[PDB]
């Protein structure tokens, strides 16, 4: 009933630009053991959700999630100094694929990365980290409120599950946690019990598709906090994750 679709992170594309095969196929089989798709790049549009992995110095910018340089001879382009950009002379070691997979944080291979030598003294600053997980049942919406996230310019995880978001909880911290229903492909009261009763420790906002049932279920459950429409607008989805990003403040304080 409905149409049994899951995507996650199963479905999350990586592009590469790299004539080095030898890396090239390292690199893009390693990815490919979880759900990531690579592509070969050769013209495509550059997606905020998406990352470019290249050879050699690059006459590119890539407006995307991130672009990763694998030097070969020459440099040009920067590195980790800009929005998004990773430099490092290397056929393919083990480290640059697991910083893939640490970007996405995926972690389903166990290969213990740790560093085979202490190139920079990274400077390890956090404290402007909300991150905001946007799980949708229809993949296209997923991608379009994500955007207007995006657009605020804030940490967002694309993910499509019931367990998964409870799930996602217990992998790391969530601040907000969006759930948005515009098909019931599946039953949802297991989604709101399971995630009170495993450690629910956050504001969940429930925006769906018309609020007739939504209102009665969503009551009973009392697992959300707070609720939209799925047509949400760019204002809408502001004010509500400006309200709870101050809620939160006033809770954790600085």
């Known amino acids: 009933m409905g149409g049994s679709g899951v995507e996650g992170l199963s479905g999350k594309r990586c592009w590469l630009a790299v004539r080095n095969a030898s890396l090239c196929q390292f690199l893009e089989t390693s990815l490919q053991r979880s759900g990531i798709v690579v592509t070969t790049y050769e013209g495509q549009e550059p997606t905020p959700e998406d990352v470019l992995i290249t ?24 590195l980790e100094k800009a929005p ?8 393919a070691p083990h480290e640059l694929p697991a910083l893939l997979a640490r970007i996405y ?56 599950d019931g367990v998964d978001a409870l799930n996602v909880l217990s992998k790391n911290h969530i601040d907000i946690v969006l759930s948005d229903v515009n ?58 994750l400006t309200l709870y990003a101050e809620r939160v403040r006033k809770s954790r304080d600085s």
């Open 55 to 78: 050879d050699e110095v690059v006459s590119k910018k890539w407006q995307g999630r991130a672009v990763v340089t694998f030097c070969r001879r020459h440099i040009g382009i920067p």
């Open 84 to 91: 998004g950009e990773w430099v490092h002379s290397v056929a």
């Open 105 to 160: 944080l995926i972690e389903m291979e166990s290969d213990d990365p740790a560093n085979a030598l202490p190139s920079t003294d990274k400077a390890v600053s956090d404290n402007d980290d909300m991150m905001i997980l946007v799980v949708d049942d229809h993949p296209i919406n997923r991608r379009l409120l994500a955007d207007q996230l995006g657009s605020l310019g804030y940490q967002c995880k694309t993910a499509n």
């Open 183 to 240: 098909m019931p492909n599946m039953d949802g009261y297991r989604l709101t019990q399971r995630i009170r009763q495993l450690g629910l420790t956050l504001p969940v906002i429930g925006v769906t598709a018309n609020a007739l049932a939504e209102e009665k279920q969503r009551c009973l459950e009392s697992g959300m906090d707070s609720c939209l429409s799925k047509p949400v607008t760019l204002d809408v989805i502001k004010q509500t």
